[PDB]
């Protein structure tokens, strides 16, 4: 399906469950990240991999959503082969940089205001 996000802890058993669903109908998109970013919920730089299957059947996709719910598999993509997906990725990078720089400015402003608030 996608080189999504998983903490790589139940990926083997995730493959086993998907092999108990279908007989491995489609090769699972495989990717791994070394020393990844902080997870939004866990709040730590946890290791991440991903092993997820693409499907053509509707019931199969429903089961994939079910097993993604049952497991710790974050999946919110727009998996489109053509170039518009990569243009979307570039725009996402631009927004990410904007978020980073505004967050830095806000943090510095907060620090200054807090120092003044202490001294008063």
């Amino acid at each position: 399906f996608v080189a999504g996000v998983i903490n790589r802890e139940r990926i083997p058993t995730f493959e086993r469950m998907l092999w108990r669903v279908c007989r491995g109908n489609v090769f699972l998109r495989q990717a791994e990240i070394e020393n990844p970013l902080e997870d939004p919920v866990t709040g730590d730089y946890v290791h991440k991999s991903v092993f997820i299957i693409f499907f053509q059947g509707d019931q199969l996709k429903n089961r994939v959503k079910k097993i993604c719910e049952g497991f710790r598999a974050s999946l919110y993509p727009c998996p489109e082969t053509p170039q518009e997906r990569k243009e979307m990725a570039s725009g996402v990078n631009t927004r990410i940089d904007d978020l980073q720089m505004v967050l830095n400015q806000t943090e510095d402003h907060r620090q200054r205001v807090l120092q003044a608030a202490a001294k008063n």
């Binding site: 493959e15 086993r16 092999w19 007989r23």
Partner: protein
């Protein structure tokens, strides 16, 4: 006089229900084989009346026979071979 044909009623209706039951189970086996394999051929359904206490031996035999096929996925329903139970 109700009991008279009541025997025929219940016996015939149980006959129909049982026939439907075994037919459904055969369809289930056909579907399971056709899914666990691709374009299928002579999957060889088989009937077993297991001897007493020899369930463990039969499970071992079938595991040795066909556990290479999956080796990771197929228990209560996940066997290395298509499996069903029948009461009688």
């Amino acid at each position: 006089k109700q009991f008279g044909p009541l025997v025929r009623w219940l016996k015939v209706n149980f006959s129909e229900a049982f026939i439907a039951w075994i037919h459904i189970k055969a369809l289930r086996v056909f579907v399971e084989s056709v899914l666990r394999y691709g374009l299928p051929v002579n999957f060889q359904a088989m009937l077993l009346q297991p001897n007493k206490k020899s369930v463990k031996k039969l499970r071992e035999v079938l595991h040795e026979l066909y556990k290479h096929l999956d080796s990771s996925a197929a228990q209560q329903e996940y066997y290395p071979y298509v499996y069903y139970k029948i009461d009688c």
